Design an enzyme around this catalytic site. Structure first.
Site, short mmCIF file in Angstrom:
data_model
loop_
_atom_site.label_atom_id
_atom_site.label_comp_id
_atom_site.label_asym_id
_atom_site.label_seq_id
_atom_site.Cartn_x
_atom_site.Cartn_y
_atom_site.Cartn_z
CG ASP A 131 -1.81 1.05 1.41
OD1 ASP A 131 -1.55 2.12 1.31
OD2 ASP A 131 -3.24 0.74 1.08
CG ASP A 157 -2.92 -6.81 5.52
OD1 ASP A 157 -2.88 -8.19 5.95
OD2 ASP A 157 -3.73 -6.24 5.01
#
Length: 180
Positions: free
Chosen positions: A24, A132
């Site tokens: 991300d 994550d």
């Protein structure tokens, strides 16, 4: 294979966390980038940083400046992994990750970040915590970590930054908007 057992999943008296390698590039839910815009600082992309499952990020369901923004978590591999969602790794490997973002309890994270409480809950694979792990520069897969099953503990960021500069220091977290 899952080596952790019970509800929630534990391994030899230690709480387990599941992991997923992700990428991300957005600033993220702890404000770790310049105030005006949605970009990260220069250090985020190559660091050991993580998005924490919602109830661990913030038990009050915040999406911004959660309780555990800036906290460092030391992960130790069990040797296991979720079948079809990871792969083999040596047991006892360890690195420390700073929480810089949220893994929200919404699609597409509904199987992993859906614990109902900060502690004592479970995702669909039984784990009370999920992280994550940022991997856009192969910092995690370069170590042979393909979504390893882990045990987890809170540690001082500075102590671990000394051993591996990829773990951000407390000074670095001070740059983030949520530190203030």
């Amino acid at each position: 294979n899952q080596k952790c057992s019970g509800n929630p999943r534990r391994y030899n008296g230690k709480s387990c966390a599941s992991t997923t390698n992700y990428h991300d590039s957005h600033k993220g839910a702890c404000g770790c980038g310049p105030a005006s815009g949605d970009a990260q600082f220069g250090w985020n992309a190559g660091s050991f940083v993580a998005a924490a499952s919602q109830m661990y990020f913030d038990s009050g369901n915040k999406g911004w400046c959660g309780q555990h923004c800036g906290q460092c978590i030391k992960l130790t591999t069990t040797g296991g992994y979720v079948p079809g969602q990871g792969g083999p790794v040596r047991e006892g490997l360890s690195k420390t990750f700073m929480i810089t973002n949220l893994c929200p309890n919404i699609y597409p994270n509904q199987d992993w970040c859906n614990q109902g409480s900060q502690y004592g809950g479970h995702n669909k694979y039984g784990y009370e915590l999920h992280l994550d792990l940022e991997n856009g520069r192969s910092q995690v897969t370069g170590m042979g970590w393909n979504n390893p099953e882990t045990t987890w503990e809170v540690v001082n960021c500075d102590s671990e930054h000394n051993h591996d500069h990829r773990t951000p220091s407390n000074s670095m977290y001070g740059q983030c908007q949520c530190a203030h």
